[PDB]
Amino acid sequence: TIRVVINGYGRIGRNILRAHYENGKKHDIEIVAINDLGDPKTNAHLTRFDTAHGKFPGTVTVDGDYMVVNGDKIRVLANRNPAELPWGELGVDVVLECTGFFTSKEKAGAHLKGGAKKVIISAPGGKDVDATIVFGVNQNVLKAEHTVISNASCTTNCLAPLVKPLHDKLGVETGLMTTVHAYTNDQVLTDVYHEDLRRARSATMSMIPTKTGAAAAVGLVLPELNGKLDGFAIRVPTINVSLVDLSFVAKRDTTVEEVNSILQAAAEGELKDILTYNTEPLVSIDFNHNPASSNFDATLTKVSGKLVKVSSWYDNEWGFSNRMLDTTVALMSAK
Amino acid sequence: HHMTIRVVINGYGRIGRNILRAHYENGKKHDIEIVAINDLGDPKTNAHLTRFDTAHGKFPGTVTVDGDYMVVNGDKIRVLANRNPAELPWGELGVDVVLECTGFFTSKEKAGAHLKGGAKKVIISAPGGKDVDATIVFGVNQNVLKAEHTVISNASCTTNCLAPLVKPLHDKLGVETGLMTTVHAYTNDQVLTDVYHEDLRRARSATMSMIPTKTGAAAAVGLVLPELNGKLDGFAIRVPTINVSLVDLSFVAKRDTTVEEVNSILQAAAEGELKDILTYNTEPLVSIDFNHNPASSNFDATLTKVSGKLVKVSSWYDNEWGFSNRMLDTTVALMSAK
Amino acid sequence: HHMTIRVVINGYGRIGRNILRAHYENGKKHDIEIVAINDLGDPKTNAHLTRFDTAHGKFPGTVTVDGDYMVVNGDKIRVLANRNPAELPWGELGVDVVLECTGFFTSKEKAGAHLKGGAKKVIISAPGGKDVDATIVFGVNQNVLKAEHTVISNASCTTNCLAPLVKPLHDKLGVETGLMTTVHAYTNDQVLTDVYHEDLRRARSATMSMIPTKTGAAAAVGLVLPELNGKLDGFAIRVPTINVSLVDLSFVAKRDTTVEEVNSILQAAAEGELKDILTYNTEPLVSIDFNHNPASSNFDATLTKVSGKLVKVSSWYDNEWGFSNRMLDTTVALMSAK
Amino acid sequence: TIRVVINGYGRIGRNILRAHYENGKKHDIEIVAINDLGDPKTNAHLTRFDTAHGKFPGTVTVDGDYMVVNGDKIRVLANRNPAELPWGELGVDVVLECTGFFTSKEKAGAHLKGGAKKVIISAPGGKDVDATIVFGVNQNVLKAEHTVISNASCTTNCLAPLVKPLHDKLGVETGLMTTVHAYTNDQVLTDVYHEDLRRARSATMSMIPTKTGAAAAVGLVLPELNGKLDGFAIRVPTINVSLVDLSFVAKRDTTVEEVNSILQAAAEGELKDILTYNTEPLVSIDFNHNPASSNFDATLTKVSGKLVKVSSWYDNEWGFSNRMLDTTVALMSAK
Ligand SMILES: [Mg+2]
Ligand SMILES: [Mg+2]
Ligand SMILES: [Mg+2]
Ligand SMILES: [Mg+2]
Ligand SMILES: [Mg+2]
Ligand SMILES: [Mg+2]
């Protein structure tokens, strides 16, 4: 059994914890501690009640130095310097690094000095991380020697399962992505100073372009695609669930039904439960709280010559949270 | 206006009301007088909706109802309510052009009822049936209009954004094939909370979801640019904004190009032949900054991507206001055709 | 269910569909079987809208269309489509109670057409005409029901929130007079972007504004609590949320009271006679936390204010789900009446 | 002519500046400097483009140490310690204190040490401020000796003009207010740690109660009402424009038309242009960018016995911004 801690009990951290309990602790993981600078009773309240993900169906209480979730005593800690955290004295196998402040292999390595064996960054990592993993696509690159890895981004976890079967079975010459994306807490309600002049604008009233690294990052996960994809994001006024819209030039002629069949076979085969195959006339909220990384919408496929468009819905919080647990197991399992 | 084009609006829904607002808000720049509105609603309600709008704010002007007339900045506009266009007193009113905005008369056969009532021409504020005399994106193909054309289509808001964007690129680079997504504001064909609709996706709350919907607007470019017939297709994703939309076109160029070259082609078009129809934008703007912008296509050079021969270009458009202003442009072009 | 109450739903709009969902989502807690739905829409569309909802999420269960039946968790529900209730085969189906959810048959005279078709009783999912046999807020006055009552009203969602809130306070403090504002989620009588409506305020975009609207729900308390007849009035402010509303009642008490005393009165009622109808809340919650809550009135003790003899009490309510569950409660009470 | 500076060029500061220029500089004021920690080009961009208030109709450029607005050179400064600001060397008459960090008479007095003559706090002040002003209701309490005052809050500026004529002409025994209020930037897009557990919840999806001091603060402005009013706020998903809903026990019997007539007479008399009188069937967005403090909606009045309900719409940004300019003049004019 793998002993995990969560560094940063924000939205990502809370959703990882909820994902662990809501699936019946399918993974051989015990969350033995949370480190967060906020006070425990507020963080427990925000675990019990969420707007996007509703009420936690389990039980959460705070008892002394512990937050108790479905009977499990999770040690609460509040040290801003990771190397002083008692990870070694606590037997910590994997730190889920969810603060957003320690996204390089160097900064995230402080957890190793404090006694933890490994760290998974809940976001794209520096150039210098040991690996960048989309679980279901490249977790086989993991090795026992790795100690700081990145779990990529929500968007890369949607795109890579979509493009891998298509590149294998059809061939991707080049591609361009737009992700139509729910707003996030790096955005604002009404216009206010921001480093980025577009994210400074009300997220509730506008479509807001923003830069994405996900199309390029698929090159890390699928090296044969390095340099072949580019794109951007459009943030729109929804609280959760996003859409990858990928246009690509196929290397040979194809049809709508062949493209769809390739993805259906992948969803029943090696990408089962990571990639799903959807034919019903659904809308974005129907994928809220769906734990898949990539919900391919076969109803939206278009083919015009060699030009193909494919679209996939993803819960940009819940899919990623569940993948953090899958990657935790695969990392402790690497030889 | 004197010895002017006399127009009437059939259907005073949002499209018709926004044509009237566009005409008055630029000071009747076009040599047009709106002399009647036919609509089945209470005239006092239609007058109130002209004074106050959520998306387009308060009308800068005066609107009163005085008997059988709605008076706008002093202009007396006859208010009618008849379901059958052939019974409308268009000959009596000396109508040059009916702006047909109901959605119920989109073929030449149906719209011809206005001509029976004595109007000289009809412009459908939407894609037309296969029998219409022309389909016009003003700035792109108004030169095809002739004096013989009597029932025409002004295409759609989305086609009016796409065609100015793709015409310069096709002329300089060639288009092999292209696929469009329009990320589009919701419209009144959608719903607040889930309820019966003919379309199972538009049956779903528009305020809470991204909602795919079909649109023929990319295929329709072939009616205005015949060299592109059959080469473009696409669909729409409706999102929770009240107005302003984004055309996102991915296409395969016939030769190699670059971000800078694509942007330069569109900059030249915006400064030249497509001035005021197509604009060129480099500032870090968001969709609401194009609300109440009368251009057809506000190209956003900051978003251009090129990977191999695949190009993505994106253009913002006020899906109500641009089209409203183009209806007036096309009215003048039609009446000027020789 | 065996030797059960056989119900049908006339009108499968949101109100009717949410009754069906409420029945199945609590596992058919009530000894009721829904044996038919009459609606003019395509049954496959109505089935899809039962499986997926924005406000209430996915139905936890199965829904298929198999011939003339919609099959819900294995239960065969006959699907009908007839505009005239007197032609519906209610006698053939052994219907005990029609849940009348169309909005078109709210008087006893009109709803009596269901009785001509052979149903035994009708419950209108809305305020009734002056001729209905009873108006029921379950938990407050279901004891007035008699076996002779055949067409009744279940009042409105807002009356079902207000009456449980005010009944305990009137009993212990006395109400001289009261005025209510309900801060209310938008509904499908409103619009996404401004368009013609009979009401000039509901003609305006519901997503961008606070919109006042009339409601008789405070006056209607007098039908269920006659001692309060004529003492309460109010109106609604529609705001941009899809579901869950807030009753905000200001009233003048007949004796002096305090925040703590007011809260204690409502706590005792919630723990006693009004259990599960009225809840008592002290946690720092917001409206979405009451979405899909089946109570009629979720009193929020954190909001209580008293200044002199003026009291303000506020209660959250899922304006769809509470009422849906109460329709089922009132069905059982009506069929149990002696 | 009064030489003004803006400390804190956030939303309040930007809207004060826009209000000055959009009304044709009706007030005998020159904004001679802005002090803000953000960089000038971002703040100029956010002056040119706003979501709630649209595009500034004037011209804004940055030229060296100055932001030029409609031809006026406004000195730009970036000192976080007010006493080091060159206010004296710059002839600063009134500092409009808009940071939200200096809301006591003591903390705000740092501007006086730096050489400014007076400070107006753009929010409720400490117990210790020299005065709390709702312009149009009590600006006559101002005196030459005052050096730190508060301009109250947006909500108090809506409520006080509403209640003053009613108390004078009818009599307010007691009252309770609900303000149905647009969200603000102290709220969040999706649930995240906050000091207040209700404001920690998504402002776009819920009605969110919050505490207000405005009903009590009307006691400062109208001492005869001290202790007689209480209330709270409900934040709802709109970006701007709010509603005061006041229920009160009148001291004598009255009617809907008398209540409305009292307010109509006040809107044409002493409260002209501060209080407006509205009978059209309007909704909240129709009052966006309206510079009044209190837009009374006569269509909503209710009277049941001695119990009266009156409602007033207010642009909670624009009305207050315009009042800051009115109060600036009245403060420099006090003898
Ligand atoms: Mg002429
Ligand atoms: Mg005729
Ligand atoms: Mg000729
Ligand atoms: Mg039975
Ligand atoms: Mg029969
Ligand atoms: Mg009996």
CSV table of C-alpha atoms in Angstrom, one decimal, chain B:
chain,number,residue,atom,x,y,z
B,1,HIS,CA,-33.8,62.0,-46.2
B,2,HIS,CA,-35.1,63.2,-49.6
B,3,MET,CA,-35.7,61.1,-52.8
B,4,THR,CA,-34.5,58.2,-50.6
B,5,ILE,CA,-34.8,54.5,-50.5
B,6,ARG,CA,-38.0,53.6,-48.7
B,7,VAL,CA,-37.6,50.4,-46.6
B,8,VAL,CA,-40.0,48.4,-44.5
B,9,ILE,CA,-39.2,45.8,-41.9
B,10,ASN,CA,-41.3,42.6,-42.0
B,11,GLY,CA,-40.9,41.0,-38.5
B,12,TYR,CA,-39.8,43.2,-35.6
B,13,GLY,CA,-37.9,40.5,-33.7
B,14,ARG,CA,-34.3,41.0,-32.7
B,15,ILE,CA,-33.1,41.1,-36.3
B,16,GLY,CA,-35.6,43.7,-37.4
B,17,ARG,CA,-35.3,45.9,-34.3
B,18,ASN,CA,-31.5,45.8,-34.6
B,19,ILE,CA,-31.6,46.9,-38.2
B,20,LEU,CA,-33.7,49.9,-37.1
B,21,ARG,CA,-31.3,50.6,-34.3
B,22,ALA,CA,-28.3,50.4,-36.5
B,23,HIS,CA,-29.9,52.8,-39.0
B,24,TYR,CA,-30.6,55.4,-36.4
B,25,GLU,CA,-27.5,55.0,-34.3
B,26,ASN,CA,-25.1,56.0,-37.2
B,27,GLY,CA,-27.4,58.9,-37.9
B,28,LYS,CA,-29.1,57.5,-41.0
B,29,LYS,CA,-25.7,57.3,-42.8
B,30,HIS,CA,-27.4,55.4,-45.5
B,31,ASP,CA,-29.9,57.2,-47.7
B,32,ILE,CA,-32.7,55.1,-46.4
B,33,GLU,CA,-36.0,55.8,-44.6
B,34,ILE,CA,-37.7,53.1,-42.7
B,35,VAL,CA,-41.4,53.9,-43.4
B,36,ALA,CA,-43.2,50.9,-41.8
B,37,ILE,CA,-42.9,47.8,-39.6
B,38,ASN,CA,-45.2,44.8,-39.9
B,39,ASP,CA,-45.3,42.7,-36.7
B,40,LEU,CA,-48.0,40.8,-34.8
B,41,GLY,CA,-47.0,42.2,-31.4
B,42,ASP,CA,-48.4,45.2,-29.4
B,43,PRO,CA,-46.7,48.3,-30.8
B,44,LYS,CA,-46.1,49.7,-27.4
B,45,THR,CA,-44.2,46.6,-26.4
B,46,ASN,CA,-42.1,46.8,-29.6
B,47,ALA,CA,-41.4,50.5,-28.8
B,48,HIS,CA,-40.2,49.7,-25.3
B,49,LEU,CA,-37.9,47.0,-26.6
B,50,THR,CA,-36.5,49.5,-29.1
B,51,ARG,CA,-35.7,52.0,-26.2
B,52,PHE,CA,-34.0,49.4,-24.0
B,53,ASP,CA,-31.9,46.4,-24.9
B,54,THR,CA,-29.6,44.3,-22.7
B,55,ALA,CA,-27.0,43.5,-25.3
B,56,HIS,CA,-27.0,46.9,-27.1
B,57,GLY,CA,-28.0,49.2,-24.2
B,58,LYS,CA,-30.3,52.1,-24.4
B,59,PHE,CA,-31.3,53.6,-27.7
B,60,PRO,CA,-29.6,57.1,-28.0
B,61,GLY,CA,-32.8,58.8,-29.2
B,62,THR,CA,-36.5,59.0,-28.8
B,63,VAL,CA,-39.3,56.5,-29.5
B,64,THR,CA,-43.0,57.2,-29.0
B,65,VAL,CA,-46.2,55.6,-30.2
B,66,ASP,CA,-48.6,58.1,-31.6
B,67,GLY,CA,-51.7,56.4,-33.1
B,68,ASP,CA,-50.8,54.1,-36.0
B,69,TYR,CA,-47.2,55.3,-36.0
B,70,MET,CA,-44.0,54.6,-34.0
B,71,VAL,CA,-42.1,57.9,-34.0
B,72,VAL,CA,-38.3,57.5,-33.9
B,73,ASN,CA,-36.2,60.7,-33.6
B,74,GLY,CA,-39.2,62.4,-35.1
B,75,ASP,CA,-39.6,60.0,-38.0
B,76,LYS,CA,-43.2,58.6,-38.4
B,77,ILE,CA,-43.0,54.8,-39.0
B,78,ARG,CA,-46.3,53.1,-39.9
B,79,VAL,CA,-47.1,50.1,-37.7
B,80,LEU,CA,-48.9,47.2,-39.3
B,81,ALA,CA,-50.0,43.7,-38.2
B,82,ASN,CA,-50.9,41.3,-41.0
B,83,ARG,CA,-49.8,37.7,-41.4
B,84,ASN,CA,-50.1,37.6,-45.2
B,85,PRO,CA,-47.6,39.8,-47.1
B,86,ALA,CA,-49.7,40.0,-50.2
B,87,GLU,CA,-52.3,42.0,-48.2
B,88,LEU,CA,-49.7,44.5,-46.9
B,89,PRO,CA,-50.1,48.1,-48.4
B,90,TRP,CA,-46.6,48.2,-49.8
B,91,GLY,CA,-47.7,49.8,-53.1
B,92,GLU,CA,-49.6,52.4,-51.2
B,93,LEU,CA,-46.5,53.2,-49.1
B,94,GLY,CA,-44.2,53.3,-52.1
B,95,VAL,CA,-41.9,50.6,-50.7
B,96,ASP,CA,-38.6,50.1,-52.5
B,97,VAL,CA,-37.3,47.2,-50.3
B,98,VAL,CA,-38.8,44.9,-47.8
B,99,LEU,CA,-36.3,43.7,-45.2
B,100,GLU,CA,-37.8,40.2,-44.6
B,101,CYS,CA,-36.9,39.3,-41.0
B,102,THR,CA,-39.6,36.8,-39.9
B,103,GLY,CA,-37.9,33.6,-41.0
B,104,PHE,CA,-41.2,32.4,-42.6
B,105,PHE,CA,-40.6,33.7,-46.2
B,106,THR,CA,-37.1,32.7,-47.1
B,107,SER,CA,-37.8,31.4,-50.7
B,108,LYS,CA,-38.4,33.6,-53.7
B,109,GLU,CA,-41.8,31.9,-54.0
B,110,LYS,CA,-42.8,32.9,-50.5
B,111,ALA,CA,-41.1,36.3,-50.4
B,112,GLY,CA,-42.8,37.1,-53.7
B,113,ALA,CA,-45.9,37.8,-51.8
B,114,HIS,CA,-44.3,41.1,-50.8
B,115,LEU,CA,-43.9,42.0,-54.5
B,116,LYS,CA,-47.6,41.2,-55.0
B,117,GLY,CA,-48.4,43.7,-52.2
B,118,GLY,CA,-46.5,46.3,-54.3
B,119,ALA,CA,-42.9,46.3,-52.9
B,120,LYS,CA,-40.2,46.4,-55.5
B,121,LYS,CA,-37.6,44.2,-53.9
B,122,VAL,CA,-37.1,41.9,-50.9
B,123,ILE,CA,-33.9,41.2,-48.9
B,124,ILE,CA,-34.1,38.1,-46.7
B,125,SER,CA,-32.2,38.5,-43.4
B,126,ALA,CA,-31.1,34.9,-43.5
B,127,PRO,CA,-30.0,32.2,-45.9
B,128,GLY,CA,-32.4,31.9,-48.8
B,129,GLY,CA,-34.0,29.0,-50.6
B,130,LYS,CA,-32.4,27.6,-53.7
B,131,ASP,CA,-34.6,29.9,-55.9
B,132,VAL,CA,-33.4,33.3,-54.6
B,133,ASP,CA,-31.8,35.7,-57.1
B,134,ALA,CA,-28.6,36.2,-55.3
B,135,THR,CA,-26.9,35.6,-51.9
B,136,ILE,CA,-24.8,38.6,-50.8
B,137,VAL,CA,-21.9,39.1,-48.4
B,138,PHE,CA,-21.4,42.8,-48.7
B,139,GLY,CA,-17.8,43.7,-49.3
B,140,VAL,CA,-17.2,40.3,-51.0
B,141,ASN,CA,-19.7,39.9,-53.9
B,142,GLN,CA,-22.2,42.8,-54.0
B,143,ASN,CA,-20.9,43.4,-57.6
B,144,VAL,CA,-23.0,40.4,-58.7
B,145,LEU,CA,-26.2,42.3,-58.1
B,146,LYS,CA,-28.3,43.5,-61.0
B,147,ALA,CA,-31.4,45.6,-61.5
B,148,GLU,CA,-33.2,42.3,-62.4
B,149,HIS,CA,-32.6,40.8,-58.9
B,150,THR,CA,-35.8,41.2,-56.8
B,151,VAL,CA,-35.5,38.7,-54.0
B,152,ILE,CA,-32.1,38.2,-52.5
B,153,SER,CA,-30.5,36.7,-49.3
B,154,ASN,CA,-28.0,38.6,-47.1
B,155,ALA,CA,-26.6,35.2,-46.1
B,156,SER,CA,-26.1,34.8,-42.3
B,157,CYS,CA,-24.1,36.6,-39.6
B,158,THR,CA,-21.5,33.7,-39.6
B,159,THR,CA,-21.1,33.6,-43.4
B,160,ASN,CA,-20.6,37.4,-43.3
B,161,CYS,CA,-17.7,36.9,-40.9
B,162,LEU,CA,-16.1,33.9,-42.7
B,163,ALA,CA,-16.2,35.1,-46.3
B,164,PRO,CA,-14.2,38.3,-45.8
B,165,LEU,CA,-11.7,36.3,-43.7
B,166,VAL,CA,-11.2,33.6,-46.3
B,167,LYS,CA,-11.4,35.6,-49.6
B,168,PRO,CA,-8.0,37.3,-49.2
B,169,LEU,CA,-6.4,34.0,-48.1
B,170,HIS,CA,-7.8,32.1,-51.0
B,171,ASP,CA,-6.7,34.7,-53.4
B,172,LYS,CA,-3.0,34.7,-52.2
B,173,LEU,CA,-2.5,31.2,-50.8
B,174,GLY,CA,-5.2,28.9,-52.2
B,175,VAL,CA,-7.6,26.9,-50.1
B,176,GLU,CA,-7.6,23.2,-50.5
B,177,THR,CA,-10.1,22.4,-47.8
B,178,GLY,CA,-11.2,24.0,-44.5
B,179,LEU,CA,-13.2,23.3,-41.4
B,180,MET,CA,-14.7,25.9,-39.2
B,181,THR,CA,-15.8,26.0,-35.5
B,182,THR,CA,-17.8,29.1,-34.6
B,183,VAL,CA,-17.7,29.6,-30.8
B,184,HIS,CA,-21.0,31.4,-30.7
B,185,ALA,CA,-23.1,33.4,-28.2
B,186,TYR,CA,-26.5,31.9,-27.3
B,187,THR,CA,-29.6,33.0,-29.2
B,188,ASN,CA,-33.3,33.0,-28.5
B,189,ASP,CA,-33.7,29.6,-30.2
B,190,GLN,CA,-32.1,28.2,-27.1
B,191,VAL,CA,-33.4,27.8,-23.5
B,192,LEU,CA,-32.7,28.9,-20.0
B,193,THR,CA,-33.4,25.5,-18.3
B,194,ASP,CA,-33.9,22.2,-20.1
B,195,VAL,CA,-37.2,22.0,-22.0
B,196,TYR,CA,-38.7,20.4,-25.1
B,197,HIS,CA,-37.0,21.4,-28.3
B,198,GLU,CA,-36.9,19.9,-31.8
B,199,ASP,CA,-33.1,19.7,-31.3
B,200,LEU,CA,-32.0,17.6,-28.3
B,201,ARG,CA,-28.9,19.8,-27.7
B,202,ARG,CA,-30.7,23.1,-28.0
B,203,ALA,CA,-33.2,21.7,-25.5
B,204,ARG,CA,-30.5,22.0,-22.8
B,205,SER,CA,-29.8,25.1,-20.7
B,206,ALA,CA,-27.7,27.5,-22.7
B,207,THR,CA,-26.4,29.3,-19.6
B,208,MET,CA,-24.7,26.3,-18.1
B,209,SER,CA,-23.2,24.4,-21.1
B,210,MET,CA,-21.2,24.4,-24.3
B,211,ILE,CA,-23.8,23.2,-26.8
B,212,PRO,CA,-22.9,21.9,-30.3
B,213,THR,CA,-25.2,22.9,-33.1
B,214,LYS,CA,-25.3,22.5,-36.9
B,215,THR,CA,-24.8,25.5,-39.1
B,216,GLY,CA,-24.5,25.7,-42.9
B,217,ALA,CA,-22.6,28.9,-42.8
B,218,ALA,CA,-19.2,27.4,-43.9
B,219,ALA,CA,-20.8,25.5,-46.8
B,220,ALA,CA,-22.7,28.6,-47.7
B,221,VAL,CA,-19.5,30.5,-48.5
B,222,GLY,CA,-19.7,28.7,-51.9
B,223,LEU,CA,-22.7,30.7,-52.9
B,224,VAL,CA,-20.8,34.0,-52.5
B,225,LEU,CA,-17.3,32.6,-53.5
B,226,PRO,CA,-18.0,29.9,-56.0
B,227,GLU,CA,-14.3,28.8,-56.2
B,228,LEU,CA,-14.8,27.6,-52.6
B,229,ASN,CA,-17.9,25.6,-53.4
B,230,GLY,CA,-17.7,22.2,-51.6
B,231,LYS,CA,-14.4,23.1,-49.9
B,232,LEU,CA,-15.6,24.3,-46.4
B,233,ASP,CA,-17.7,22.8,-43.7
B,234,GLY,CA,-18.1,23.3,-40.0
B,235,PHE,CA,-20.4,23.6,-37.0
B,236,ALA,CA,-21.1,25.8,-33.9
B,237,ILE,CA,-20.4,25.5,-30.2
B,238,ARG,CA,-23.0,27.8,-28.4
B,239,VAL,CA,-21.5,29.1,-25.1
B,240,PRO,CA,-22.9,31.2,-22.2
B,241,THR,CA,-22.5,34.7,-23.6
B,242,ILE,CA,-25.3,37.0,-24.8
B,243,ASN,CA,-23.6,38.4,-27.9
B,244,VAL,CA,-20.4,38.4,-29.9
B,245,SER,CA,-19.1,35.2,-31.5
B,246,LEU,CA,-15.8,33.9,-32.9
B,247,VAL,CA,-15.1,32.2,-36.2
B,248,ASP,CA,-12.2,29.7,-35.9
B,249,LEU,CA,-11.2,28.5,-39.4
B,250,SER,CA,-8.7,25.7,-39.9
B,251,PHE,CA,-7.7,25.3,-43.5
B,252,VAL,CA,-5.1,23.6,-45.7
B,253,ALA,CA,-3.3,26.1,-47.8
B,254,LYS,CA,-2.1,25.2,-51.4
B,255,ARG,CA,1.3,26.6,-50.7
B,256,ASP,CA,3.5,26.9,-47.6
B,257,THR,CA,2.9,30.0,-45.5
B,258,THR,CA,3.7,31.5,-42.0
B,259,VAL,CA,1.9,33.3,-39.2
B,260,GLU,CA,3.4,36.6,-40.3
B,261,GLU,CA,2.5,36.1,-44.0
B,262,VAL,CA,-1.1,35.1,-43.2
B,263,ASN,CA,-1.4,38.2,-40.9
B,264,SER,CA,0.1,40.5,-43.6
B,265,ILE,CA,-2.4,39.3,-46.2
B,266,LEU,CA,-5.3,40.1,-43.9
B,267,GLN,CA,-3.8,43.4,-42.9
B,268,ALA,CA,-3.6,44.5,-46.5
B,269,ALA,CA,-7.2,43.4,-47.1
B,270,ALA,CA,-8.4,45.3,-44.1
B,271,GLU,CA,-6.6,48.4,-45.2
B,272,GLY,CA,-7.8,48.1,-48.8
B,273,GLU,CA,-10.6,46.4,-50.6
B,274,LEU,CA,-12.4,45.1,-47.4
B,275,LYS,CA,-12.0,48.3,-45.3
B,276,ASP,CA,-14.7,48.7,-42.6
B,277,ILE,CA,-16.0,45.2,-43.4
B,278,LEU,CA,-12.9,43.3,-42.2
B,279,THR,CA,-10.8,44.8,-39.4
B,280,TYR,CA,-7.3,43.9,-38.3
B,281,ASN,CA,-6.7,43.6,-34.6
B,282,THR,CA,-3.4,43.2,-32.7
B,283,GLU,CA,-4.5,44.4,-29.2
B,284,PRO,CA,-5.1,41.9,-26.3
B,285,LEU,CA,-8.9,42.1,-26.5
B,286,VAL,CA,-11.8,39.8,-25.5
B,287,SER,CA,-15.2,39.2,-27.0
B,288,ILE,CA,-17.1,42.0,-25.2
B,289,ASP,CA,-14.8,44.5,-26.7
B,290,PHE,CA,-16.4,43.8,-30.1
B,291,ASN,CA,-19.9,44.1,-28.8
B,292,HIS,CA,-21.7,46.8,-30.8
B,293,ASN,CA,-18.9,46.8,-33.4
B,294,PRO,CA,-20.5,47.2,-36.9
B,295,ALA,CA,-17.8,45.3,-38.8
B,296,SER,CA,-18.6,41.9,-40.4
B,297,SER,CA,-15.3,40.3,-39.4
B,298,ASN,CA,-12.8,41.5,-36.8
B,299,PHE,CA,-9.7,39.4,-37.5
B,300,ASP,CA,-7.6,38.7,-34.5
B,301,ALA,CA,-4.0,38.5,-35.6
B,302,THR,CA,-2.8,37.5,-32.1
B,303,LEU,CA,-4.5,34.1,-32.5
B,304,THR,CA,-3.1,33.0,-35.9
B,305,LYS,CA,-1.4,29.7,-36.0
B,306,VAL,CA,0.4,27.8,-38.7
B,307,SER,CA,1.7,24.2,-38.5
B,308,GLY,CA,2.9,22.8,-41.8
B,309,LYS,CA,0.3,23.8,-44.4
B,310,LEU,CA,-2.4,23.9,-41.8
B,311,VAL,CA,-3.5,27.4,-41.0
B,312,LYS,CA,-5.9,28.6,-38.2
B,313,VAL,CA,-7.3,32.1,-38.4
B,314,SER,CA,-9.9,33.5,-36.0
B,315,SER,CA,-12.3,36.5,-36.3
B,316,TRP,CA,-14.6,38.1,-33.8
B,317,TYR,CA,-18.0,39.3,-34.8
B,318,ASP,CA,-21.0,41.0,-33.2
B,319,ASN,CA,-23.4,38.4,-34.6
B,320,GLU,CA,-26.3,40.9,-34.3
B,321,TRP,CA,-24.8,44.3,-35.1
B,322,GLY,CA,-22.5,43.5,-38.0
B,323,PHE,CA,-25.3,41.8,-39.9
B,324,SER,CA,-27.7,44.6,-39.1
B,325,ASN,CA,-25.4,47.2,-40.6
B,326,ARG,CA,-24.8,45.0,-43.7
B,327,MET,CA,-28.5,44.7,-44.3
B,328,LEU,CA,-28.4,48.5,-44.8
B,329,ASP,CA,-25.3,48.3,-47.0
B,330,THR,CA,-26.9,45.6,-49.2
B,331,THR,CA,-30.1,47.6,-49.5
B,332,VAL,CA,-28.2,50.5,-51.0
B,333,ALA,CA,-26.2,48.1,-53.3
B,334,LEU,CA,-29.4,46.4,-54.5
B,335,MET,CA,-31.2,49.7,-55.3
B,336,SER,CA,-28.0,51.0,-57.0
B,337,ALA,CA,-27.6,47.9,-59.3
B,338,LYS,CA,-27.8,48.6,-63.0
